[PDB]
A paper describes a structure:
Prokaryotic cell envelopes often include proteinaceous surface (S-) layers composed of self-assembling subunits in porous two-dimensional crystalline lattices. S-layer anchoring is best characterized for Gram-positive bacteria, where S-layer proteins non-covalently attach to the PG layer via species- and strain-specific non-classical secondary cell wall polymers (SCWPs). [name] possesses three consecutive [name] domains near its N-terminus, followed by a large C-terminal region presumed to harbor the self-assembling domain(s). The crystal structures and binding analyses presented here of [name] SpaASLH, SpaASLH/G109A, and SpaASLH/G46A/G109A with synthetic SCWP fragments provide novel insights into the functional contributions of many conserved [name] domain residues, including [name]-Trp13, [name]-Gly29, and [name]-Arg43, which precisely interlock from three different [name] domains to generate two active binding sites.
To investigate the molecular details of SCWP binding by [name] domains, we synthesized the monosaccharide 4,6-Pyr-β-d-[name], which represents the pyruvylated moiety of [name] SCWP, and co-crystallized it with SpaASLH. The first co-crystal structure determined reveals ligand bound in G2 only, in a narrow pocket formed by conserved residues from all three [name] domains: Arg61 (corresponding to the conserved [name]-Arg43 of the TRAE motif) from SLH1; Met107, Gln108, Gly109 (corresponding to the conserved [name]-Gly29), Lys110, Glu127, and Lys130 from SLH2; and Trp151 (corresponding to the conserved [name]-Trp13) from SLH3. The pyruvate moiety of the ligand is bound deep in the pocket through salt bridge interactions to Arg61 and Lys130 and hydrogen bonds to Gln108 and Gly109 backbone amides, while the hydrophobic face of the ManNAc ring stacks against Trp151. To further investigate the activity of these two potential binding sites, we performed isothermal titration calorimetry (ITC) analysis of SpaASLH binding to 4,6-Pyr-β-d-[name] in solution, which revealed 1:1 binding with an apparent dissociation constant (KD) of 29 nM. Upon binding in G2 of wt SpaASLH, the phi angle of Gly109 ([name]-Gly29) and the psi angle of Gln108 ([name]-28) each flip by ~180°. The backbone carbonyl of Gln108, which hydrogen bonds to Arg61 (the conserved [name]-Arg43) when unliganded, is resultantly replaced in space by the Gly109 backbone amide nitrogen, which forms a hydrogen bond to a pyruvyl carboxyl of ligand. Concurrently, the removal of the hydrogen bond between Gln108 and Arg61 allows Arg61 to make a bidentate interaction with a pyruvyl carboxyl and O6 of ligand. The backbone flip requires the flexibility of [name]-Gly29 in this location as the resulting phi–psi angles are disallowed for all other amino acids. Therefore, the near universal conservation of [name]-Gly29 suggests that this backbone flip is part of a conserved mechanism for [name]–SCWP binding.
Author numbering: 28 to 192
Write the structure that this text describes.
Amino acid sequence: AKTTQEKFDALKEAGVFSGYPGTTDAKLGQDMTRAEFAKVLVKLFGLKEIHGQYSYKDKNYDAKNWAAPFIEAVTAEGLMQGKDLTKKIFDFNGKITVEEASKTLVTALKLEPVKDAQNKATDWAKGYFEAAVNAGLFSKDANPKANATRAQLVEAAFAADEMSK
Ligand SMILES: CO[C@@H]1O[C@@H]2CO[C@](C)(C(=O)O)O[C@H]2[C@H](O)[C@@H]1NC(C)=O
């Protein structure tokens, strides 16, 4: 029965998550940018970084932005598409929510969204969130609309990696 900290240690050693300078603090109560999560997903599923392509219009989404290869890589993979197709905003500094994370992971694992699912998640996300709860990636008592904590993301990422194999 591994702890969240032991799961983090494992994922860090595998380069999927990172820690923080000068400390052993994995900061498991803190949250994570959608940019950082994109990089998590790339490391977790072994995707190819995509350089010199920019599919979004956010301020400072350009070549000087370290996250673009990652965000592009998950966009090409179909795991993420940003918050508005018309204006092409990804929101890379915005924090990843439990239901957003649920979408990326169910899709990556090729699990089926639950049609007509009922739960506290935003309408677009109810099927993904329910599917993630069922697979054990988050607890049914998690707030789907909340920023996901690192801990929650470690546990989701660890479970996902195990299913993946
Ligand atoms: C506000 O609209 C939502 O934004 C979500 C943001 O995060 C992810 C995981 C993503 O694809 O980046 O999911 C997005 C939702 O699918 C949804 N976006 C749209 C265009 O409907």
